[PDB]
UniProtKB/Swiss-Prot annotation, chains A, C, F, G, J, L:
Protein name: Major prion protein
Record comment regarding domains: The normal, monomeric form, PRPN(C), has a mainly alpha-helical structure. Misfolding of this form produces a disease-associated, protease-resistant form, PRPN (Sc), accompanied by a large increase of the beta-sheet content and formation of amyloid fibrils. These fibrils consist of a cross-beta spine, formed by a steric zipper of superposed beta-strands. Disease mutations may favor intermolecular contacts via short beta strands, and may thereby trigger oligomerization. Contains an N-terminal region composed of octamer repeats. At low copper concentrations, the sidechains of His residues from three or four repeats contribute to the binding of a single copper ion. Alternatively, a copper ion can be bound by interaction with the sidechain and backbone amide nitrogen of a single His residue. The observed copper binding stoichiometry suggests that two repeat regions cooperate to stabilize the binding of a single copper ion. At higher copper concentrations, each octamer can bind one copper ion by interactions with the His sidechain and Gly backbone atoms.
Lineage: superkingdom: Eukaryota
Disorder: PrP is found in high quantity in the brain of humans and animals infected with neurodegenerative diseases known as transmissible spongiform encephalopathies or prion diseases, like: Creutzfeldt-Jakob disease (CJD), fatal familial insomnia (FFI), Gerstmann-Straussler disease (GSD), Huntington disease-like type 1 (HDL1) and kuru in humans; scrapie in sheep and goat; bovine spongiform encephalopathy (BSE) in cattle; transmissible mink encephalopathy (TME); chronic wasting disease (CWD) of mule deer and elk; feline spongiform encephalopathy (FSE) in cats and exotic ungulate encephalopathy (EUE) in nyala and greater kudu.
Further comment: This protein is produced by a bicistronic gene which also produces the alternative prion protein/AltPrP (AC F7VJQ1) from an overlapping reading frame. The alternative prion protein/AltPrP (AC F7VJQ1) and PRNP have no apparent direct functional relation since a mutation that removes the start codon of the AltPrP has no apparent effect on the biology of PRNP. In mouse and hamster, the alternative initiation AUG codon is absent and is replaced by a GUG codon.
Described function: Its primary physiological function is unclear. May play a role in neuronal development and synaptic plasticity. May be required for neuronal myelin sheath maintenance. May promote myelin homeostasis through acting as an agonist for ADGRG6 receptor. May play a role in iron uptake and iron homeostasis. Soluble oligomers are toxic to cultured neuroblastoma cells and induce apoptosis (in vitro). Association with GPC1 (via its heparan sulfate chains) targets PRNP to lipid rafts. Also provides Cu(2+) or Zn(2+) for the ascorbate-mediated GPC1 deaminase degradation of its heparan sulfate side chains.
Length: 6, 6, 6, 6, 6, 6, 6, 6, 6, 6, 6, 6
């Protein structure tokens, strides 16, 4: 999975 | 943005 | 700040 | 768009 | 609740 | 499994 | 502030 | 527990 | 202690 | 697998 | 490395 | 501040 800071 | 993988 | 799972 | 607020 | 599934 | 901010 | 894994 | 300061 | 296991 | 905050 | 500024 | 995954 990927987690991104908006 | 900027992203990490987990 | 917002951190979102893709 | 499942997100936490950090 | 301020959570995301990981 | 989840990440939660408190 | 804390981030906790459960 | 499994927590870090953030 | 600055890391958690995920 | 580790998530670290520095 | 697998990092994001937060 | 950084979040890193290893």
């Amino acid at each position: 999975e990927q987690m991104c800071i908006t | 943005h900027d992203c990490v993988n987990i």
